[PDB]
């Protein structure tokens, strides 16, 4: 219908202008807090900021998109047509590849366990343009239905299609698979370490309650068997604050020595419990509360704060991935099925709905850093305090 597509053509440009100004403002804020501080920046954060400037370069083009959607035809040249449609393509592959190497960096720092960062940034920015060279050469303002539009068309055989499919798979299916594999292994690693910290701590207290009400030596041996196995496993636990540190660090050696004392007090109580002594085994288990409160619970809450901080840190970049994979995914599926096949109101409506959905993503990323971000929110108040004087 002409009325429904005109309703979409009126809905698009002011949402485009609002998204342009909001994404532009939030992105300058992210950039200035990235540039004004260097001692706190991280490698994953270098990627996070590159995706930011990429959406700045995208956000400078929505005035042209708003003008062309308001006029109803590509008032511009075919040259600009590809100019814009490539900028959006390098935004897409910059987002995909930067989140892919964010996933690999977090896989290295979590599952497997910088002066050369600019070379890595220049590699990703280039690879995006390479996978966008097909977008640059395949899009030219043409004429259909009496109006000029900025859209790609497969016309005049083997080289074009071959490279198009190759680059497509290399930048989309391959990375996405790397991302879901790395993020599932990270989530399974961090949640198991939450479980291994808790269940080793759960049985070091629950079985201590069984000792005080056992009334014979038979249950004291079976309770202390589980606590010697729990304290041996909990000594082997590597916290994320000590995962990057050396295994022979002096901070870890105090944590291991507390479990070298705690198992030796289980061993003293097990030595009494095998002799049939029930009162002396419970009394030797009273010193197990003393050492836990002075060696282990000090390192339990330090590990339970660092591990949950990493879960808090991993939940904002997966949400950054999931927002990027909810906005920029259905628009590229629309532009792939149109080139694959070469009522009618539904196709034009779903084209424009995903057109404004993927273009919204330049606003949705500074939204996530302000809401569930743990580094941008603290340092945005830092630069606001230094200027409000």
């Amino acid at each position, epitope marked *: 219908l002409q009325e429904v597509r005109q309703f979409s053509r009126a809905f698009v440009p002011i949402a485009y202008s609002l998204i342009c100004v909001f994404g532009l403002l939030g992105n300058i804020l992210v950039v200035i807090t990235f540039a004004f501080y260097k001692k706190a920046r991280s490698m994953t954060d270098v990627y996070l900021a590159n995706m930011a400037i990429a959406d700045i370069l995208f956000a400078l083009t929505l005035p042209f998109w708003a003008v062309s959607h308001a006029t109803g035809a590509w008032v511009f040249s075919n040259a600009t047509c590809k100019l814009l449609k490539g900028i959006y393509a390098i935004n897409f592959n910059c987002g995909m590849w930067l989140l892919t190497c964010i996933a690999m960096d977090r896989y290295i720092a979590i599952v497997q366990a910088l002066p050369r960062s600019k070379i890595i940034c220049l590699v990703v920015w280039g690879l995006s343009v390479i996978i966008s060279s097909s977008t640059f050469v395949f899009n030219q303002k043409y004429n259909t239905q009496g109006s000029d539009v900025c859209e790609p068309k497969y016309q005049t055989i083997r080289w074009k299609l071959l490279m198009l499919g190759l680059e497509l798979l290399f930048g989309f299916f391959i990375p996405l698979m790397f991302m879901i594999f790395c993020y599932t292994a990270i989530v399974k690693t961090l949640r198991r370490q939450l479980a291994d910290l808790e269940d080793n701590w759960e049985t070091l207290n629950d079985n201590l309650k069984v000792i005080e009400k056992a009334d014979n030596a038979a249950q004291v041996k079976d309770a202390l068997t*589980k606590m010697r*196995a*729990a304290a*041996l*496993d909990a000594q*082997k636990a590597t916290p994320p604050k000590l995962e990057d540190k050396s295994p022979d660090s002096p901070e870890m050696k105090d944590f291991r020595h507390g479990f*070298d004392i705690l198992v030796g007090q289980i*061993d003293d109580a*097990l*030595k009494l419990a095998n002799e049939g002594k029930v009162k002396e085994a419970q009394a030797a288990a009273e010193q197990l509360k003393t050492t836990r409160n002075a060696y282990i619970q000090k390192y339990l809450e330090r590990a339970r704060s660092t591990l949950q901080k990493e879960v808090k840190a991993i939940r904002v970049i997966i949400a950054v991935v999931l927002v990027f994979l909810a906005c920029q995914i259905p628009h590229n599926m629309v532009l792939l099925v149109t080139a694959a096949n070469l009522s009618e109101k539904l196709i034009a409506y779903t084209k424009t709905v995903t057109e404004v959905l993927a273009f919204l993503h330049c606003c949705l990323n500074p939204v996530l850093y302000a809401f569930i971000g743990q580094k941008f929110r603290n340092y945005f108040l830092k630069i606001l305090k230094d200027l409000w004087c």
Partner: antibody
Amino acid sequence: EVQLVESGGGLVQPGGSLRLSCAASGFNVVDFSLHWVRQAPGKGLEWVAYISSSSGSTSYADSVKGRFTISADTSKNTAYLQMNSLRAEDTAVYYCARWGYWPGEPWWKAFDYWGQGTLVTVSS
Amino acid sequence: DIQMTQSPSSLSASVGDRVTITCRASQSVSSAVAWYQQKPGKAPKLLIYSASSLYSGVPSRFSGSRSGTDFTLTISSLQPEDFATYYCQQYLYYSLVTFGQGTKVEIKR
């Protein structure tokens, strides 16, 4: 050169008594806990008893409790196993193995050096 | 108390093969599992201690792993001189030692 040498395994009657003298060399008794693992002919390894002569913590398996008595002395640097009221099920090859004290690495090396064993045949 | 279950009680392999013996603990035995090799008529010899660590004098083809209460001994390349019986043993405590039932590795024919 660290080694454990068993002796005293032989031929006894049911209900008899014999002492197996596991000697040692190259290391002392009070820095290594000595255990007895026996192996019946055609069967697997079964733990029997242990002693920690630095303190004295003689524990036994439930099949040998009361009848068996493990002992050691550090002047001669040997270990002993006094077995009484033997049945046909005690016919085995008796190994003595050393195992270090908690904490550190030598506790984790469980039974790193074994003795060659002595055969005890209990039959009427 | 704590039981030890060694699954492949008879194993047939040839020279150059890759072997895998699985031992499982009844309770939580927390990496306190050793592996032993015994030739017939001889004392056992420690191969892998602490469920993964390779003992000195043991060649690098032998290896160990732990996945919870499941434990695994692996020989990568099987030489003719390691046709013997293999025992797993939990050692959570001095008085708590229980061995596996034993797996004998024979020549494939």
